[PDB]
Amino acid sequence: TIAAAIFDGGVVLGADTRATAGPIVAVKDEMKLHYISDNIWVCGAGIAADNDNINAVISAKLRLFQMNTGLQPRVDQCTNILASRLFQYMGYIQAALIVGGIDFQGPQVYQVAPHGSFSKQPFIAQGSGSLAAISVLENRWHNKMNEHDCMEMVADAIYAGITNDLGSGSHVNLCVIKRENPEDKQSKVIYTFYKDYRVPHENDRNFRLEPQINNIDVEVIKTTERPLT
Amino acid sequence: MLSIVGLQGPDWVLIAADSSVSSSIICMSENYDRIAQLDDRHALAMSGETGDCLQLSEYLQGNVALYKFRNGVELSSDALAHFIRHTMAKAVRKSPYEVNMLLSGYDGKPHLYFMDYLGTLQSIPYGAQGYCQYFVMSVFDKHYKEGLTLEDGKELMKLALNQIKQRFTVAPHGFIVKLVDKNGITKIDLE
């Protein structure tokens, strides 16, 4: 479950932290919200390596763009590059991305489908828990909502996916792209990443047999030690 | 598709069969008798799934015995061959017996019948079911003389079986060869 909505002064992206190796939770604290530029973040659903590499590649492209050109990467620019890259792979790179950022055109949230389709929407939810998240976003998102309301809404959407979707779980990470000065629309676009913005307590391991009963006796055939050099 | 060979002579039929039974790539046994003696006069070499050849052999032998007991007379080699063909044709229409057979018999005159799984009944002087028919036929063709002596017939059957052993990729570990003649069915060793 990843999501991203636009509030009055910026964008709130959010993602669960579960990565699944099929039916098994491979990662319980996986990072799906990825910095693209100081003004653009991308949450990602789909194949974990696909999202990681597409986000790293477009982040590198826009970092080069900002270093050479000196220009703040645009959310539509990031989305166009992601959409073109995902389209040239014909959906093979399974990265359903949400690009949330701020540029001179304000705060923008785009979705980029794995096949290279893209769309600017006020709020987006993608991933296996996208429907549970998008219910929350549909019933909670409104124009010019404030930063905290959108934070709570996006966190509740990620949490809806966590609770309802088995492919989604663990914590809610958020990122809030805003401007350092809400009054000034030319003020620096900052991002605040809330790692573990929600850590659902009912999803914590309630029990643990601390004196682990173990009857497997380890027999060492051979022990060889070497200096760590 | 196991190797069964048949060689009808003037007054005998040498009926050989792959004596080795395998479970996939494992040779389970090396003396497996695939020539079901349906009667004291008829040996039916069978080539196919061991468990379908066994069931067909049991059914055919039981029906031959039932004919002999119910009717005091025994089935002729032609009559038994046509009964087997009737069984195989009924099956292939309903549930094919995946068993290709050589019915050797001696009802006073030697008989050898090619009997495919479908129900193809054909009296033959010699024949084979399995892939060995691709290897033995020419041998027989090149070396079968009319009026073979039983020893010349044994040499010819040994020739065909050695052709299988030497040239057939899936070469049987050995063959069980039975002589069907006026003395009944006797397991003869080709040496």
Binding site: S84, Q111, G116, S117, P122 | -
Partner: protein
């Protein structure tokens, strides 16, 4: 999807629904299916959003390429856009599953070109595409008039796209309208509350 481009006397009215469908899920219910190729060239997009968006991107690229070597940037731009979309749909016929109604205004006036998913480009005064357009075919036939102005064509296009929206699951949401005249393109959004009718016309 429902697309309906009407070449009127005084301009082009490109209407569409806003529903992107992923099965029975609407990943984008405010989809802008009429892409602005140029200020007065728009591409109503039907089919794979990736494919049709690539077609819009590539036709913008090809129209800029058309303008590399010329100064009459406003000449044959709708016709070239249609030709390019046709060439891309034919060239990527295996890959692209996309039909584009490229409508708008250029030096040649108001023009609508329907490039079907097959890659068949045809100049039309009334072009319709998408699964929703089917439901409104008879409606269009009985309510389209060649003499409709851009206002009349806009009202008719809103009504037709609303009918397709109501009857088509793949079509829904707002009616995205683009009115392209010589002076430029005006975008309008007819949200379900502002649409002439709703689900209640079904059996009544």
């Amino acid at each position: 999807t429902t697309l309906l481009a009407i070449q009127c006397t005084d301009g082009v009215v490109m209407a569409s629904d806003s529903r992107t469908s992923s099965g029975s899920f609407i990943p984008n219910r405010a989809t802008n299916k009429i892409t602005e190729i140029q200020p007065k060239i728009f591409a109503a997009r039907c089919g794979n959003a990736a494919d049709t968006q690539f077609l819009a991107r590539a036709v913008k690229n090809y129209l800029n390429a058309l303008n590399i070597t010329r100064e009459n940037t406003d000449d044959s731009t709708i016709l070239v856009a249609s030709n390019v979309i046709r060439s891309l749909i034919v060239r990527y016929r295996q890959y692209l599953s996309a039909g584009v109604i490229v409508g708008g205004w250029d030096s040649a006036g108001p023009q609508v070109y329907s490039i079907e998913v097959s890659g068949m480009a045809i100049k039309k005064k009334i072009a319709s595409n998408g699964s929703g357009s089917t439901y409104i075919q008879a409606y269009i036939d009985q309510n389209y008039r060649e003499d409709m102005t851009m206002e009349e064509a806009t009202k008719f296009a809103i009504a037709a796209v609303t009918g397709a929206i109501i009857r088509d699951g793949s079509s829904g949401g707002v009616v995205n309208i683009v009115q392209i005249n010589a002076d430029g393109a005006k975008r309008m959004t007819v949200r379900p509350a502002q649409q002439p009718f709703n689900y209640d016309i079904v059996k009544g």
